[PDB]
Design a protein around this ligand. Structure first.
Ligand SMILES: [Zn+2]
Length: 243
């Protein structure tokens, strides 16, 4: 189809290679796959991590918390992977150039990290066991050890039916949100969340609930849907399933 869309597709595959040659996807595993490359953690200020290709060396900020350290790595690997490919890296200078080309890149490294941390197979494995549910999300994130928001988007891209996924924290407030396939009813951040809503009941009752209800659209209009909430340390993850 479009360039980016096919470009995205490729950058997905490359991950699939790199890490198909791996024993899982914990941090240290992703490091051992580094085919003769210098990998160093130090303090880099506000810099998360940079990849110097001529010294074949990755740098990750030792200061930042672990999760992003892990993410940064996947992202900067994807940096690595890319430049490793000419047929792709070429296609890019064919429909893009300038800062454009830069902004595009980093979005792919992002797309990269995505896949490289959360395999297309760990997701379907979960969707299969728990369905498209707040629960599923809660696991993938745990199991993958990634950010509530990272899963959110991953989980959705690989979902058949109309369904919305949403993270929630107390002020409630939607924090992030994503919708599968061809659902064009969107749910913003900031969107407040009523105390009567099943999602809430589940937080100060740290109790996994599952029942019908609606999408608490901030435009007031209650759209009906099946909801499955899974609460945890300060947040509840939530799957609205549109009929
Ligand atoms: Zn980058």
């Amino acid at each position: 189809p479009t360039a980016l869309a096919a470009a995205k597709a490729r950058m997905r595959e490359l991950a699939a290679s790199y890490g198909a040659g791996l024993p899982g996807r914990d941090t240290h595993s992703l490091m051992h796959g580094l085919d003769g490359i210098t990998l160093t953690f130090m303090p880099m200020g506000q810099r998360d991590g940079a990849y110097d290709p001529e010294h074949h060396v990755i740098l990750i900020n030792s200061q930042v918390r672990p999760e992003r350290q892990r993410f940064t790595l996947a992202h900067e690997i994807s940096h690595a992977l890319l430049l490793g490919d000419d047929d792709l890296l070429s296609d890019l200078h064919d429909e893009y150039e300038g800062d454009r080309l830069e902004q595009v890149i980093e979005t792919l490294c992002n797309v990269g990290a995505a896949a490289l941390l959360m395999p297309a197979e760990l997701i379907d494995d979960l969707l299969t066991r728990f369905g498209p549910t707040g629960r599923a999300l809660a696991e993938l994130a745990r199991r993958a050890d990634v950010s509530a928001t990272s899963a959110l988007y991953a989980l959705a891209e690989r979902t058949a039916p109309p369904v919305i996924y949403a993270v929630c924290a107390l002020s409630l407030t939607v924090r992030a949100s994503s919708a599968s396939a061809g659902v064009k009813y969107s749910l913003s951040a900031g969107t407040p969340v009523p105390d009567d809503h099943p999602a809430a009941l589940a937080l100060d009752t740290r109790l996994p609930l599952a029942q019908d209800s609606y999408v608490p659209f901030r435009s007031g209009r209650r759209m009906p849907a099946y909801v499955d909430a899974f609460p945890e340390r300060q947040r509840v993850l939530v799957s609205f399933a549109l009929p």
